[PDB]
């Protein structure tokens, strides 16, 4: 039953446009009279290895940028570069612009992705920012410019714009001010992502979700200290658990009656012994892309 | 990377309303000047065990039905029952009504669910109709009236309206003409779902998705006949594979160069030997809630 659940996507759907520069097409985000999109739309195959974006942008004129909203052609009024995003001024403000803000999220946090091709939404799914600042998304060629977001009542918080795939199949992108998450650059070069680690506070949230849903077998009698837990966690490539994380798990602990450090003792045994062919929430691996908030809202129905 | 992916939900979001009858609140679908919702909204705790819906509806008047769209109160003009759904005539046609049709889907088919509480969308996820006509959804109390749908370009095909949870945690609902999928009834009584079986054509689609994504280890040298495959499949509670299913897998077979019956031979060995602790697409179990269409569109970017 318990599953990855995205935010309703309607407010973002009304913002997605197609941006074509030369032979290249990708997606842009139309808020008020500005369309945001990856600046690598202005590259050519002749310049992808080490483009000089300042020079490339100089050579462009407004009319080199074809922007379409549905089947409607928006005239670009001006163009500028903010870090790795291009801001295309258009002569019409998007009448479907929602209330929004730009936010830069933290590793371990989750968001919904509205995957788009040729400016048209194709699917919505929940994703997480990995500790190494990649996202393990589902993106095909031409998905660049698709955005990740969270919704707070009426307000859309945009946190990710998709830029590229790393040759290992994971994905890299920026905040909506164009700063990459992680060490990545928007050129065709060999790029290593760091070692990825497991998001411990999220695995704990998911164990609480298991308990909430009656899956309880992994619970044991014991407790542990944060330090003692963290010693084992390091050896299994788990992120350190902080007192902040303990405090963030407070609501789930209160709902189930299981102290955070008691859940930590259960996770410690699971790491040392594996699942012996049993499953938790219909899964044979420990899931780390549900936040405590994610669990709370799917198990409490936040709208 | 490969994951469950829902349709963009915007067109359905504009249709969700709150319906309150007495002390009970659930969701309704506002299309043109009609709001559709589960007829069990008219029950009371005193009548839930064996309600007489004809009599209960007789006793209701238009003003017993409180319908709200956002914070706007729609006046019910008339009320009628079509099988297990109530059709509330309201004096305003929904200006956000999309192009739509009502469809009754087949076991094994998938759809997106827009989960709603108090008439407000809370999340979107992909679901499948189980062979025993349950759906393994993520629904809390008050989610009744939430709908499942597919999108064909501009047209929303509604196929499911959520009615109730069965005490085993799976869910039961109707098409949008109010006919339950499966043997279930909308009263508080002991209700068995039949034995559930694995959707073989979907497991095959998901193995093709694995191959498309470079996960190839389970491939073997052999082929098999449909009959020979089906003999083994029965013993593992797999649905029979038909020639229609073979034909439906044609596109995926053509893309990967693996004949359908060769994939069937690989699945036959996986069933008899298990995965030996290996995973396919990051999963230690065989996934059966992706259709061949689902795979094609996520691996080809249908908008
Ligand atoms: C110019 C630059 C920065 C090198 C670049 C080039 C191509 C793209 N990719 C576009 O699909 C695409 C479409 N329109 C423009 N680019 C894809 C992409 O990353 N390929 C490769 C680029 C470097 C080598 C490895 C990956 C892509 C595929 C799947 C999901 N997401 C994006 C992204 C950035
Ligand atoms: C009257 C009738 C048909 C017996 C009924 C009663 C309650 C509801 N449930 C409402 O939550 C709800 C909210 N408003 C009105 N009903 C829930 C539901 O099925 N409980 C039980 C009903 C019979 C015994 C087992 C389950 C529900 C929970 C989680 C997800 N989905 C629905 C559905 C149908």
DSSP string, B118-151: TTEEEEEEEEE--TTS-B-----TT-TT-EEEEE
CATH tag, B13-90: 2.40.10.10
**b (16+ CB within 10 A) / e for A94-109:** beebbebeebebebbb
Q: Are B200 and B239 in contact (CB under 8 A)?
A: yes
The structural architecture, per CATH, of the domain B98-174 is: Beta Barrel (2.40)
Ligand 1 pocket residue status of A48, Cβ below 6 Å: yes
What sign has the CA pseudo-torsion A206, A212, A215, A220? positive
What distance in Å separates residue B81's CA from the closest CA in chain A? 29
Q: What is d(CA A121, CA A167) in angstroms, rounded to the nearest whole number? A: 25
What fold characterizes domain A14-90? Thrombin, subunit H (2.40.10)
Alpha helices per DSSP H over chain B: 10-13, 53-59, 200-212, 226-235, 243-248, 250-256, 260-273, 292-298
CA of B184 to the centre of ligand 2 (A): 13
Kindly give, in sequence order, each residue whose CB lies less than 8 Å from that of residue A154, ignoring residues fewer than 6 positions away. A98, A99
Q: How far is the CA of B167 from the centre of ligand 2 (A)?
A: 10
Domain ranges of chain B: 13-90, 98-174, 200-297
Task: Pick the ligand that lies closest to the CA of residue A165.
Answer: 1
DSSP line for A112-180: EEEEEETTEEEEEEEEE--TTS-B-----TT-TT-EEEEEETTEEEEEEEEEEE-TTS-EEEE-TTSPB
**Distance between CA atoms of B271 and B218, rounded to whole angstroms?**
11
Q: How far is the C-alpha of B57 from the C-alpha of B52, rounded, in Å?
A: 9
Q: How close is the Cα of A267 to the center of ligand 1, in Å?
A: 39
- Please, which residues have CB within 8 angstroms of residue B276's CB and are 6 or more apart in sequence? none
- Answer yes or no: same fold for B13-90 and B98-174: yes
Note whether B68 contacts A: Cβ–Cβ < 8 A.
no
Q: Which residue has the tokens 């995926």?
A: B252
Residue B27 pairs in a beta bridge with B18
Q: A276: which 2 tokens?
A: 């012996």
Residues of A annotated as catalytic (active site), given as ranges: 40, 144
Phi, psi for A293 (deg, rounded to 5): -65, -50
Other C-beta atoms lying within 10 Å of the C-beta of residue B273: 9
Q: What letter does residue A281 receive in the DSSP assignment?
A: T
> Are A42 and A62 within 8 A, CB to CB?
no
Q: Which two tokens stand for residue A149?
A: 């977001």
Angle at B176 (CA atoms; ends B66, B121), nearest 5 degrees: 55
Give the C-alpha distances (Å, rounded to integers) separating B246 from B94, B243, B259, B287, B288.
Answer: 43, 5, 9, 18, 16
Q: Give helix B200-212 / helix B260-273 axis angle, nearest 10°.
A: 100
The token duo for B101 is: 């049709």
Asked if A4's CB is within 8 angstroms of B125's CB, the reply is: yes
Per-residue tokens: B208: 């093709």
Count of CB atoms situated within 10 Å of the CB of B293: 16
Q: Rounded distance, CA B31 to CA B161, Å?
A: 14
Burial label, B47 (beta-carbon count in 10 A; 0-12, 13-18, 19+): middle
Do A35 and A78 meet the contact criterion of CB atoms below 8 Å apart?
A: no
- In whole angstroms, give the CA distance from residue B193 to residue B165: 11
Structure determined via: X-ray
Provide the CATH topology of domain B200-297. Answer: main proteinase (3clpro) structure, domain 3 (1.10.1840)
User: Which atom, in ligand 2's list, is nearest to the CA of B137?
Assistant: 30
Q: How far apart (Å, rounded) are the C-alpha atoms in residues A153 and B121?
A: 10
* String of DSSP letters for B19-43: EEETTEEEEEEEETTEEEEEGGGG-
Instruction: Give the containing element (helix H, strand E) for A254.
Output: helix A250-256
> Which residues in A lie closer than 8 A to residue B283 (C-beta atoms)?
284
Pairing label, strands B110-117, B120-128: antiparallel
Neighbour count for residue A83 (Cβ, 10 Å): 13
Where does residue B283 rank: exposed (0-12), middle (13-18), buried (19+ CB within 10 A)?
Answer: middle
Q: How far is CA A235 from CA A197, A232, B277, in A?
A: 11, 6, 21
C-beta A43 within 6 A of ligand 1: yes
Distance A111 CA to ligand 1 centre (A): 22
- The tokens for B275 are 């995965």
B188 lines ligand 2 (CB under 6 A): yes
Three-class SS of residue A93? coil
Q: Could you tell me the end-to-end alpha-carbon distance of chain B, in angstroms, rounded to an integer?
A: 19
CA angle B41, B45, B49 (to 5 degrees): 90
Q: Does residue B181 contact residue B42 with C-beta atoms inside 8 Å?
A: no
> Strand, coil or helix: what is A44?
coil
Residues of B in contact with A120 (CB under 8 A): 303
- Residues A148, A171 contacting (CB under 8 angstroms): no
DSSP A39: G
For residues A118 and B129, what is the distance between their CA atoms, to the nearest angstrom?
Answer: 31
Mutation target vs B (from A2, A6, A15, A206; most B CBs, 10 A cutoff): A6
Topology, domain A200-298:
main proteinase (3clpro) structure, domain 3 (1.10.1840)
Q: Show the tokens assigned to B216.
A: 């190839």
Residue B235 φ/ψ, nearest 5 degrees: -75, -15
Q: Which residues pair with A106 in a beta bridge?
A: none
Give the experimental resolution in Å.
1.8
Contact B303, A121 (CB under 8 A): yes
Q: Does B9 touch chain A (CB under 8 A)?
A: yes
A278 and chain B in contact, CB less than 8 A = no
> For residue A257, what are the contacts with CB-CB under 8 A and spacing of at least 6?
none
Element (H, E) at A223: none
Closest CA to B19 of B65, B54, B51, B77: B65
**Torsion of Cα atoms, B111 then B117 then B120 then B122, to 10°:** -60
| Encoded tokens for B78 | 């008339």
Judge contact between B148 and B112, C-beta under 8 A: yes
């Amino acid at each position: 039953g318990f599953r990855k659940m995205a935010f309703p996507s309607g407010k973002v759907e009304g913002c997605m446009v197609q941006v074509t520069c030369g032979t290249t097409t990708l997606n842009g985000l139309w808020l008020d009279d500005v369309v945001y999109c990856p600046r690598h739309v202005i590259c050519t195959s002749e310049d992808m290895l080490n483009p000089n974006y300042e020079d490339l942008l100089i050579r462009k004129s407004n009319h080199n940028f074809l922007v379409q909203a549905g089947n409607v052609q928006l005239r670009v009024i001006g163009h500028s570069m903010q870090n790795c995003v291009l801001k295309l001024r258009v002569d019409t403000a998007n009448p479907k612009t929602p209330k929004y803000k730009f936010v830069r999220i933290q590793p371990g946090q989750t968001f919904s992705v509205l995957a788009c091709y040729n400016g048209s939404p194709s699917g919505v799914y929940q994703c997480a920012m990995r500790p190494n600042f990649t996202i393990k998304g589902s993106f095909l060629n031409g998905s660049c410019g698709s955005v990740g977001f969270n919704i707070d009542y009426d307000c859309v918080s945009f946190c990710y714009m998709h830029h590229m795939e790393l040759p290992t199949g994971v994905h890299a992108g920026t905040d909506l001010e164009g700063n990459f998450y992680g060490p990545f650059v928007d050129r065709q070069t060999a790029q290593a992502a760091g070692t990825d680690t497991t998001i411990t506070v999220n695995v704990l949230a998911w164990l609480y979700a298991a308990v909430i849903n009656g899956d309880r077998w992994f619970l044991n009698r014991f407790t542990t200290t944060l330090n003692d837990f963290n010693l084992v966690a390091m050896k299994y490539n788990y992120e350190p658990l902080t007192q902040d994380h303990v405090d963030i798990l407070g609501p789930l602990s209160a709902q189930t009656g299981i102290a955070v450090l008691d859940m930590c003792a259960s996770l410690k045994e699971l790491l040392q012994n594996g699942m012996n062919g049993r499953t938790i929430l219909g899964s044979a691996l420990l899931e780390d892309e549900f936040t405590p908030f994610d669990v709370v809202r799917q198990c409490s129905g936040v709208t």
